[PDB]
Amino acid sequence: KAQIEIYYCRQCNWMLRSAWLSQELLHTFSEEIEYVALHPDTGGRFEIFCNGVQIWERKQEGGFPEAKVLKQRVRDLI
Amino acid sequence: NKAQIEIYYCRQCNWMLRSAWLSQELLHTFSEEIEYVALHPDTGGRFEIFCNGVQIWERKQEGGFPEAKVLKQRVRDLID
Amino acid sequence: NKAQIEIYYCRQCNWMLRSAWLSQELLHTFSEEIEYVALHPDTGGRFEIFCNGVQIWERKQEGGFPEAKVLKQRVRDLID
Amino acid sequence: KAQIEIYYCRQCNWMLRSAWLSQELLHTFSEEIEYVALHPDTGGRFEIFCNGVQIWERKQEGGFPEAKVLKQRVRDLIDP
């Protein structure tokens, strides 16, 4: 089962959107997911991993993922 | 040093909502002492929470679900 | 016909989280019988919930916060 | 105070993102907001209103708002 990690900058007030994305994944892949973990992190960081594979990086992407895009990148890995 | 919290909830009992909430309560209160809070979709009737390997909540055992205050406190006692 | 629910929570007591949760519990369970669920940031110590004008929860009165089940039930009795 | 309404398609599984956006606003404008209301709606609808002014329409915008953009559109209509 999939192991998803979400790292978000602790003081950038990004927990909200992280918890949301977390539930979007838990809701859509309730049976293919082992767990979705939220990692409070340091400045400007927002990165998501699926089974060890980075499926999102704020700077790289220049922003935050849409629910649809994230679901899709996760789907392609499971 | 940094707490590891695991939340197991019955996948089909519609308990994700309350699990995600409790997760945010902890992440919000212990934003600096927590390594991560993990949500584990599980099987029938299960709702159990662990902190650094220590079970701090079991639905049957407790006969229900934890209040935000009680859970924070049980986590706090394990973080110091 | 469709229920109107209002949730007043103390703005600075860090109660938005639990309010947003309860709001989603209701929207999820009564997605077809609810007109809307409104969250009202309020003043000190206040946490009160109304359904179609009827108060179904008062923190002091109840001495705490409602369980998802109890709140659903009190709302259900005012719809049905 | 501002009055915000969020209409989302009830069966499109859009409550989640609606509740999130709701909290983003309640958190950022905790003192300038009267209330944020979530309205479960019909097919394909996702529209947001602020003090009677439409600040978002899914088709019109061809998608969903970023937290920053929505905050901004609300701020421009708010009693500064």
Coordinates of all heavy atoms in Angstrom, one line a residue, chain B:
Chain B
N1 N 12.8 12.8 20.5 CA 12.7 14.3 20.6 C 11.5 14.8 19.8 O 10.7 15.6 20.4 CB 14.0 14.9 20.0 CG 14.2 16.4 20.4 OD1 14.2 16.7 21.6 ND2 14.3 17.2 19.4
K2 N 11.3 14.3 18.6 CA 10.2 14.7 17.8 C 9.2 13.6 17.8 O 9.5 12.4 17.4 CB 10.6 15.0 16.4 CG 11.5 16.3 16.2 CD 10.8 17.5 16.9 CE 11.5 18.8 16.5 NZ 11.3 19.1 15.1
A3 N 8.0 13.9 18.2 CA 6.9 12.9 18.3 C 6.4 12.3 17.0 O 6.3 13.0 16.0 CB 5.8 13.4 19.1
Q4 N 6.2 11.0 17.0 CA 5.6 10.3 15.8 C 4.3 9.8 16.2 O 4.1 9.0 17.1 CB 6.5 9.1 15.4 CG 8.0 9.5 15.2 CD 8.8 8.4 14.6 OE1 8.5 7.2 14.9 NE2 9.7 8.8 13.7
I5 N 3.2 10.4 15.6 CA 1.9 10.0 15.9 C 1.2 9.3 14.8 O 1.2 9.7 13.6 CB 1.1 11.3 16.3 CG1 1.7 11.9 17.6 CG2 -0.4 11.0 16.5 CD1 1.3 13.3 17.8
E6 N 0.5 8.2 15.1 CA -0.2 7.4 14.1 C -1.7 7.3 14.5 O -2.0 7.0 15.7 CB 0.4 5.9 14.1 CG 1.9 5.8 14.3 CD 2.6 6.2 13.0 OE1 2.0 6.2 11.9 OE2 3.9 6.4 13.1
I7 N -2.6 7.5 13.5 CA -4.0 7.4 13.8 C -4.6 6.4 12.8 O -4.6 6.6 11.6 CB -4.7 8.8 13.5 CG1 -4.2 9.8 14.5 CG2 -6.2 8.7 13.7 CD1 -4.6 11.2 14.3
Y8 N -5.2 5.3 13.4 CA -5.8 4.3 12.6 C -7.3 4.4 12.7 O -7.9 4.4 13.8 CB -5.4 2.9 13.1 CG -3.9 2.6 12.9 CD1 -3.0 3.1 13.8 CD2 -3.4 1.9 11.9 CE1 -1.6 2.9 13.7 CE2 -2.1 1.6 11.7 CZ -1.2 2.1 12.6 OH 0.2 1.9 12.4
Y9 N -8.0 4.6 11.6 CA -9.5 4.7 11.6 C -10.1 3.8 10.6 O -9.6 3.6 9.5 CB -9.9 6.2 11.3 CG -9.5 6.6 9.9 CD1 -10.4 6.6 8.9 CD2 -8.2 7.0 9.6 CE1 -10.1 7.0 7.6 CE2 -7.8 7.4 8.3 CZ -8.8 7.4 7.3 OH -8.5 7.8 6.1
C10 N -11.3 3.3 11.0 CA -12.0 2.4 10.1 C -12.4 3.1 8.8 O -13.1 4.1 8.8 CB -13.3 1.9 10.8 SG -14.6 1.4 9.6
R11 N -11.8 2.6 7.7 CA -12.0 3.2 6.4 C -13.4 3.4 5.8 O -13.6 4.4 5.1 CB -11.2 2.2 5.4 CG -11.4 2.6 3.9 CD -10.9 1.5 3.0 NE -9.6 1.1 3.3 CZ -9.2 0.2 4.3 NH1 -10.2 -0.4 5.0 NH2 -8.0 -0.1 4.5
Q12 N -14.3 2.5 6.2 CA -15.7 2.6 5.8 C -16.7 3.1 6.8 O -17.9 3.2 6.5 CB -16.1 1.3 5.2 CG -15.9 0.1 6.2 CD -15.8 -1.2 5.5 OE1 -15.1 -1.4 4.5 NE2 -16.6 -2.2 6.1
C13 N -16.2 3.5 8.0 CA -17.1 3.9 9.0 C -17.3 5.5 9.0 O -17.9 6.1 9.9 CB -16.6 3.6 10.4 SG -16.3 1.8 10.7
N14 N -16.7 6.1 7.9 CA -16.8 7.5 7.8 C -16.2 8.2 9.0 O -16.8 9.0 9.6 CB -18.3 7.9 7.7 CG -18.4 9.4 7.5 OD1 -19.5 10.0 7.7 ND2 -17.4 10.1 7.1
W15 N -15.0 7.8 9.3 CA -14.3 8.3 10.4 C -13.0 9.2 10.0 O -12.3 9.6 10.9 CB -13.8 7.2 11.4 CG -15.0 6.6 12.2 CD1 -16.3 7.1 12.3 CD2 -14.9 5.4 13.0 NE1 -17.0 6.2 13.1 CE2 -16.2 5.2 13.5 CE3 -13.9 4.5 13.2 CZ2 -16.5 4.1 14.3 CZ3 -14.2 3.4 14.1 CH2 -15.5 3.2 14.6
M16 N -12.8 9.3 8.7 CA -11.7 10.1 8.2 C -11.8 11.5 8.7 O -10.8 12.1 9.1 CB -11.6 10.0 6.7 CG -10.5 10.9 6.2 SD -10.7 11.4 4.3 CE -11.9 12.9 4.5
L17 N -13.0 12.1 8.6 CA -13.2 13.4 8.9 C -12.7 13.8 10.3 O -11.9 14.7 10.5 CB -14.7 13.7 8.9 CG -15.3 14.7 7.8 CD1 -14.4 14.7 6.6 CD2 -16.7 14.4 7.5
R18 N -13.2 13.0 11.3 CA -12.8 13.2 12.7 C -11.3 12.9 12.9 O -10.7 13.5 13.8 CB -13.7 12.4 13.6 CG -13.4 10.9 13.6 CD -14.5 10.2 14.4 NE -15.8 10.2 13.8 CZ -16.9 9.8 14.3 NH1 -16.9 9.3 15.6 NH2 -18.1 9.8 13.7
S19 N -10.8 12.1 12.1 CA -9.3 11.7 12.2 C -8.5 12.9 11.7 O -7.5 13.2 12.3 CB -9.0 10.4 11.4 OG -9.7 9.3 12.0
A20 N -8.9 13.4 10.6 CA -8.2 14.5 10.0 C -8.2 15.7 10.9 O -7.3 16.5 11.0 CB -8.8 14.9 8.6
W21 N -9.3 15.9 11.6 CA -9.5 17.0 12.5 C -8.6 16.9 13.7 O -7.8 17.8 14.0 CB -11.0 17.0 13.1 CG -11.1 17.8 14.4 CD1 -10.8 19.1 14.6 CD2 -11.7 17.3 15.6 NE1 -11.1 19.4 15.9 CE2 -11.6 18.3 16.6 CE3 -12.2 16.0 16.0 CZ2 -12.1 18.2 17.9 CZ3 -12.6 15.9 17.3 CH2 -12.5 16.9 18.2
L22 N -8.6 15.7 14.3 CA -7.7 15.4 15.5 C -6.3 15.6 15.1 O -5.5 16.1 15.8 CB -8.0 14.0 16.0 CG -9.3 13.8 16.7 CD1 -9.6 12.3 17.0 CD2 -9.3 14.6 18.1
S23 N -6.0 15.2 13.8 CA -4.6 15.3 13.3 C -4.2 16.8 13.3 O -3.1 17.1 13.7 CB -4.5 14.8 11.9 OG -3.5 15.4 11.2
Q24 N -5.1 17.6 12.8 CA -4.8 19.1 12.7 C -4.7 19.7 14.1 O -4.0 20.7 14.3 CB -5.8 19.8 11.9 CG -5.8 19.4 10.4 CD -6.8 20.1 9.6 OE1 -6.7 21.3 9.3 NE2 -7.9 19.4 9.2
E25 N -5.5 19.2 15.1 CA -5.5 19.7 16.4 C -4.1 19.5 17.0 O -3.5 20.4 17.6 CB -6.5 19.0 17.3 CG -7.9 19.3 17.0 CD -8.4 20.7 17.5 OE1 -7.5 21.4 18.2 OE2 -9.5 21.1 17.2
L26 N -3.5 18.4 16.8 CA -2.2 18.0 17.3 C -1.1 18.8 16.5 O -0.2 19.3 17.1 CB -1.9 16.5 17.2 CG -2.9 15.6 18.0 CD1 -2.5 14.1 17.7 CD2 -2.8 15.9 19.4
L27 N -1.2 18.8 15.2 CA -0.2 19.5 14.4 C -0.2 21.0 14.7 O 0.9 21.7 14.7 CB -0.5 19.4 12.9 CG -0.3 18.0 12.3 CD1 -0.9 17.9 10.9 CD2 1.2 17.6 12.3
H28 N -1.3 21.5 15.1 CA -1.5 23.0 15.4 C -0.9 23.3 16.8 O -0.2 24.3 17.0 CB -2.9 23.4 15.4 CG -3.2 24.8 15.5 ND1 -2.8 25.7 14.4 CD2 -3.7 25.6 16.4 CE1 -3.1 26.9 14.8 NE2 -3.7 26.9 16.0
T29 N -1.2 22.4 17.8 CA -0.7 22.6 19.1 C 0.7 22.3 19.4 O 1.4 22.9 20.1 CB -1.6 21.7 20.1 OG1 -2.9 22.2 20.1 CG2 -1.0 21.9 21.6
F30 N 1.2 21.2 18.7 CA 2.6 20.8 18.9 C 3.4 20.9 17.6 O 4.2 20.0 17.2 CB 2.7 19.3 19.4 CG 1.8 19.1 20.6 CD1 0.6 18.5 20.6 CD2 2.3 19.5 21.9 CE1 -0.2 18.2 21.7 CE2 1.5 19.3 23.0 CZ 0.3 18.6 22.9
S31 N 3.2 22.0 16.8 CA 3.8 22.2 15.5 C 5.3 22.1 15.6 O 6.0 21.9 14.5 CB 3.4 23.6 15.0 OG 3.9 24.6 15.8
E32 N 5.9 22.3 16.7 CA 7.4 22.2 16.9 C 7.9 20.9 17.5 O 9.1 20.7 17.5 CB 7.9 23.4 17.6 CG 7.8 24.7 16.7 CD 8.1 26.0 17.5 OE1 9.1 26.1 18.2 OE2 7.2 26.9 17.4
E33 N 7.1 20.2 18.2 CA 7.5 19.0 18.9 C 7.1 17.7 18.1 O 7.4 16.6 18.5 CB 7.0 18.9 20.3 CG 7.2 20.2 21.1 CD 6.1 21.2 20.7 OE1 4.9 21.1 21.0 OE2 6.6 22.3 20.2
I34 N 6.4 17.9 17.0 CA 6.0 16.7 16.2 C 6.8 16.5 14.9 O 7.0 17.4 14.1 CB 4.5 16.9 15.8 CG1 3.6 16.5 17.0 CG2 4.1 16.0 14.6 CD1 2.1 16.7 16.8
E35 N 7.2 15.3 14.7 CA 7.9 14.9 13.5 C 6.9 14.7 12.4 O 7.1 15.2 11.3 CB 8.6 13.5 13.7 CG 9.6 13.2 12.6 CD 10.1 11.8 12.7 OE1 10.4 11.3 13.8 OE2 10.3 11.2 11.6
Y36 N 5.8 14.1 12.8 CA 4.7 13.8 11.8 C 3.5 13.2 12.5 O 3.6 12.5 13.5 CB 5.2 13.0 10.6 CG 5.4 11.5 11.0 CD1 4.3 10.6 11.2 CD2 6.7 11.0 11.2 CE1 4.5 9.3 11.6 CE2 6.9 9.6 11.5 CZ 5.8 8.8 11.7 OH 5.9 7.5 12.0
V37 N 2.3 13.4 11.8 CA 1.1 12.8 12.3 C 0.7 12.0 11.0 O 0.6 12.6 9.9 CB 0.0 13.8 12.6 CG1 -1.3 13.1 12.8 CG2 0.4 14.6 13.9
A38 N 0.4 10.7 11.2 CA 0.1 9.9 10.1 C -1.3 9.3 10.2 O -1.7 8.8 11.3 CB 1.1 8.8 9.9
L39 N -2.1 9.4 9.1 CA -3.4 8.8 9.1 C -3.4 7.5 8.4 O -3.0 7.4 7.2 CB -4.4 9.8 8.4 CG -4.7 11.1 9.3 CD1 -5.4 12.1 8.4 CD2 -5.6 10.7 10.4
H40 N -3.9 6.5 9.0 CA -3.9 5.1 8.4 C -5.4 4.6 8.2 O -6.1 4.2 9.1 CB -3.2 4.1 9.3 CG -1.8 4.3 9.5 ND1 -1.2 5.3 10.2 CD2 -0.7 3.6 9.0 CE1 0.1 5.2 10.1 NE2 0.4 4.2 9.4
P41 N -5.8 4.6 6.9 CA -7.2 4.1 6.7 C -7.1 2.6 7.1 O -6.2 1.9 6.7 CB -7.4 4.3 5.2 CG -6.0 4.3 4.7 CD -5.2 5.1 5.7
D42 N -8.1 2.2 8.0 CA -8.1 0.8 8.4 C -9.4 0.0 8.2 O -10.3 0.5 7.5 CB -7.7 0.8 9.9 CG -6.8 -0.4 10.3 OD1 -7.1 -1.5 9.8 OD2 -5.8 -0.2 11.0
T43 N -9.5 -1.1 8.9 CA -10.6 -2.0 8.8 C -11.7 -1.8 9.8 O -11.5 -1.0 10.8 CB -10.2 -3.5 8.8 OG1 -9.6 -3.8 10.0 CG2 -9.3 -3.8 7.6
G44 N -12.9 -2.4 9.6 CA -14.0 -2.3 10.5 C -13.9 -1.9 12.0 O -13.1 -2.6 12.7
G45 N -14.6 -0.9 12.4 CA -14.7 -0.5 13.8 C -13.4 -0.1 14.5 O -13.4 0.3 15.7
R46 N -12.3 -0.1 13.8 CA -11.0 0.3 14.4 C -10.8 1.8 14.4 O -11.0 2.5 13.4 CB -9.8 -0.4 13.7 CG -8.5 -0.1 14.5 CD -7.3 -0.6 13.7 NE -6.1 -0.4 14.5 CZ -4.8 -0.7 14.1 NH1 -4.6 -1.1 12.9 NH2 -3.8 -0.6 15.0
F47 N -10.3 2.3 15.6 CA -10.0 3.7 15.8 C -9.0 3.7 16.9 O -9.4 3.5 18.1 CB -11.2 4.6 16.2 CG -10.8 6.0 16.3 CD1 -10.6 6.8 15.2 CD2 -10.6 6.6 17.6 CE1 -10.2 8.2 15.4 CE2 -10.2 7.9 17.8 CZ -10.0 8.7 16.7
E48 N -7.7 3.8 16.6 CA -6.7 3.7 17.6 C -5.6 4.7 17.3 O -5.2 4.9 16.2 CB -6.1 2.3 17.6 CG -5.1 1.9 18.7 CD -4.9 0.4 18.8 OE1 -4.8 -0.2 17.7 OE2 -4.9 -0.1 19.9
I49 N -5.1 5.4 18.4 CA -4.0 6.4 18.2 C -2.8 6.0 19.0 O -2.8 5.6 20.1 CB -4.5 7.8 18.6 CG1 -5.7 8.2 17.8 CG2 -3.4 8.8 18.5 CD1 -6.4 9.5 18.2
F50 N -1.6 6.2 18.3 CA -0.3 5.9 18.9 C 0.6 7.1 18.9 O 0.6 7.9 18.0 CB 0.4 4.8 18.2 CG -0.3 3.5 18.3 CD1 -1.2 3.0 17.2 CD2 -0.2 2.6 19.4 CE1 -1.9 1.8 17.3 CE2 -0.8 1.4 19.4 CZ -1.7 1.0 18.4
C51 N 1.4 7.3 20.0 CA 2.4 8.4 20.1 C 3.7 7.7 20.5 O 3.8 7.1 21.5 CB 1.9 9.4 21.1 SG 3.0 10.8 21.3
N52 N 4.7 7.9 19.6 CA 6.0 7.3 19.8 C 5.9 5.8 20.2 O 6.6 5.4 21.1 CB 6.8 8.1 20.9 CG 7.1 9.5 20.5 OD1 7.2 9.8 19.3 ND2 7.2 10.4 21.5
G53 N 5.0 5.1 19.6 CA 4.9 3.7 19.8 C 3.9 3.4 21.0 O 3.5 2.2 21.2
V54 N 3.5 4.4 21.8 CA 2.6 4.2 22.9 C 1.2 4.4 22.5 O 0.9 5.5 22.1 CB 3.0 5.0 24.1 CG1 2.1 4.7 25.3 CG2 4.5 4.8 24.5
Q55 N 0.3 3.5 22.8 CA -1.1 3.6 22.5 C -1.7 4.6 23.5 O -1.7 4.4 24.7 CB -1.8 2.3 22.7 CG -3.3 2.3 22.3 CD -4.1 1.2 22.9 OE1 -4.5 1.3 24.0 NE2 -4.3 0.2 22.2
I56 N -2.2 5.7 23.0 CA -2.8 6.7 23.8 C -4.4 6.8 23.7 O -5.0 7.6 24.3 CB -2.2 8.1 23.6 CG1 -2.4 8.5 22.1 CG2 -0.8 8.1 24.0 CD1 -2.0 9.9 21.9
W57 N -4.9 5.9 22.8 CA -6.3 5.8 22.6 C -6.8 4.6 21.8 O -6.2 4.2 20.8 CB -6.8 7.1 21.9 CG -8.3 7.2 22.0 CD1 -9.2 6.6 21.2 CD2 -9.0 7.9 23.0 NE1 -10.5 6.9 21.6 CE2 -10.4 7.7 22.8 CE3 -8.6 8.7 24.1 CZ2 -11.4 8.3 23.6 CZ3 -9.6 9.2 24.9 CH2 -11.0 9.0 24.7
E58 N -7.9 4.0 22.3 CA -8.5 2.8 21.7 C -10.0 2.9 21.9 O -10.5 3.0 23.0 CB -7.9 1.5 22.4 CG -8.6 0.2 22.0 CD -9.3 0.3 20.7 OE1 -8.7 0.7 19.7 OE2 -10.5 0.0 20.7
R59 N -10.7 3.0 20.8 CA -12.1 3.2 20.8 C -12.9 2.3 21.8 O -13.7 2.8 22.6 CB -12.7 3.0 19.4 CG -14.2 3.4 19.3 CD -14.7 3.2 17.9 NE -14.7 1.7 17.5 CZ -15.6 0.9 18.0 NH1 -16.5 1.3 18.8 NH2 -15.5 -0.4 17.6
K60 N -12.8 1.0 21.7 CA -13.5 0.1 22.5 C -13.1 0.3 24.0 O -14.0 0.5 24.9 CB -13.2 -1.4 22.2 CG -13.4 -1.6 20.7 CD -13.0 -3.0 20.3 CE -13.2 -3.2 18.8 NZ -13.0 -4.7 18.4
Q61 N -11.8 0.3 24.2 CA -11.2 0.6 25.6 C -11.8 1.8 26.2 O -12.3 1.8 27.3 CB -9.7 0.7 25.4 CG -9.0 0.8 26.7 CD -7.5 0.9 26.5 OE1 -7.0 1.8 25.8 NE2 -6.8 -0.1 27.0
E62 N -11.8 2.9 25.5 CA -12.3 4.2 26.0 C -13.9 4.3 25.8 O -14.5 5.2 26.4 CB -11.7 5.4 25.2 CG -10.2 5.5 25.4 CD -9.7 5.7 26.8 OE1 -10.5 6.0 27.7 OE2 -8.5 5.5 27.0
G63 N -14.4 3.5 25.0 CA -15.9 3.5 24.7 C -16.3 4.7 24.0 O -17.3 5.3 24.3
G64 N -15.5 5.1 23.0 CA -15.8 6.3 22.2 C -14.6 7.0 21.6 O -13.6 6.4 21.4
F65 N -14.8 8.3 21.3 CA -13.8 9.1 20.7 C -13.3 10.2 21.6 O -14.1 10.8 22.4 CB -14.3 9.7 19.4 CG -14.7 8.6 18.4 CD1 -16.0 8.1 18.5 CD2 -13.9 8.2 17.4 CE1 -16.4 7.0 17.7 CE2 -14.3 7.1 16.6 CZ -15.6 6.6 16.7
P66 N -12.0 10.5 21.6 CA -11.4 11.5 22.4 C -11.7 13.0 22.1 O -12.0 13.4 21.0 CB -9.9 11.3 22.3 CG -9.8 10.9 20.8 CD -11.0 10.0 20.7
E67 N -11.7 13.8 23.2 CA -11.9 15.2 23.1 C -10.6 15.8 22.7 O -9.6 15.2 23.0 CB -12.5 15.7 24.3 CG -13.5 14.9 24.8 CD -14.4 15.4 25.9 OE1 -13.9 15.6 27.0 OE2 -15.5 15.6 25.6
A68 N -10.6 16.9 22.1 CA -9.4 17.6 21.6 C -8.4 17.8 22.8 O -7.3 17.5 22.7 CB -9.7 18.9 21.0
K69 N -9.0 18.2 24.0 CA -8.2 18.5 25.2 C -7.6 17.2 25.7 O -6.4 17.2 26.1 CB -9.1 19.1 26.2 CG -8.3 19.5 27.5 CD -9.2 20.3 28.5 CE -10.5 19.5 28.8 NZ -11.4 20.3 29.7
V70 N -8.3 16.1 25.9 CA -7.8 14.9 26.4 C -6.6 14.3 25.6 O -5.6 13.9 26.1 CB -8.9 13.8 26.5 CG1 -8.3 12.5 26.9 CG2 -9.9 14.2 27.5
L71 N -6.8 14.4 24.2 CA -5.8 13.8 23.4 C -4.5 14.7 23.4 O -3.4 14.1 23.4 CB -6.3 13.8 21.9 CG -5.4 13.0 20.9 CD1 -5.3 11.6 21.3 CD2 -5.9 13.2 19.5
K72 N -4.7 16.0 23.5 CA -3.5 16.9 23.6 C -2.7 16.6 24.8 O -1.5 16.5 24.8 CB -4.0 18.3 23.6 CG -4.6 18.9 22.4 CD -4.9 20.3 22.6 CE -5.6 20.9 21.3 NZ -6.2 22.2 21.6
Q73 N -3.5 16.4 25.9 CA -2.8 16.1 27.2 C -2.1 14.8 27.2 O -1.0 14.7 27.8 CB -3.9 16.1 28.3 CG -3.4 15.2 29.3 CD -4.5 14.7 30.2 OE1 -5.5 15.4 30.4 NE2 -4.4 13.4 30.6
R74 N -2.7 13.7 26.6 CA -2.0 12.4 26.6 C -0.8 12.5 25.8 O 0.2 11.8 26.0 CB -3.0 11.4 26.1 CG -4.1 11.1 27.1 CD -4.9 9.8 26.7 NE -6.0 9.6 27.5 CZ -6.8 8.5 27.6 NH1 -6.5 7.5 26.8 NH2 -7.8 8.4 28.4
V75 N -0.8 13.3 24.7 CA 0.4 13.5 23.9 C 1.5 14.3 24.6 O 2.7 13.9 24.6 CB 0.0 14.2 22.6 CG1 1.3 14.6 21.8 CG2 -0.8 13.3 21.6
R76 N 1.0 15.3 25.3 CA 1.9 16.2 26.0 C 2.7 15.4 27.1 O 3.9 15.6 27.3 CB 1.1 17.3 26.7 CG 2.0 18.4 27.4 CD 1.1 19.6 27.9 NE 0.7 20.4 26.8 CZ -0.6 20.5 26.4 NH1 -1.5 19.8 26.9 NH2 -0.9 21.3 25.3
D77 N 2.0 14.5 27.8 CA 2.7 13.7 28.8 C 3.7 12.7 28.3 O 4.6 12.2 29.0 CB 1.7 12.9 29.6 CG 0.7 13.7 30.4 OD1 1.1 14.9 30.8 OD2 -0.5 13.3 30.6
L78 N 3.7 12.5 27.0 CA 4.7 11.6 26.4 C 5.8 12.4 25.7 O 6.8 11.8 25.3 CB 4.0 10.7 25.4 CG 3.2 9.5 25.9 CD1 2.4 8.8 24.8 CD2 4.1 8.5 26.6
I79 N 5.6 13.7 25.5 CA 6.6 14.6 24.9 C 7.4 15.3 26.0 O 8.2 16.2 25.7 CB 5.9 15.7 24.0 CG1 5.0 15.1 22.9 CG2 6.9 16.7 23.4 CD1 4.4 16.1 22.0
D80 N 7.2 14.9 27.3 CA 8.0 15.5 28.4 C 7.5 14.9 29.7 O 7.0 15.7 30.5 CB 7.9 17.0 28.4 CG 6.5 17.5 28.3 OD1 5.7 17.3 29.2 OD2 6.2 18.2 27.2

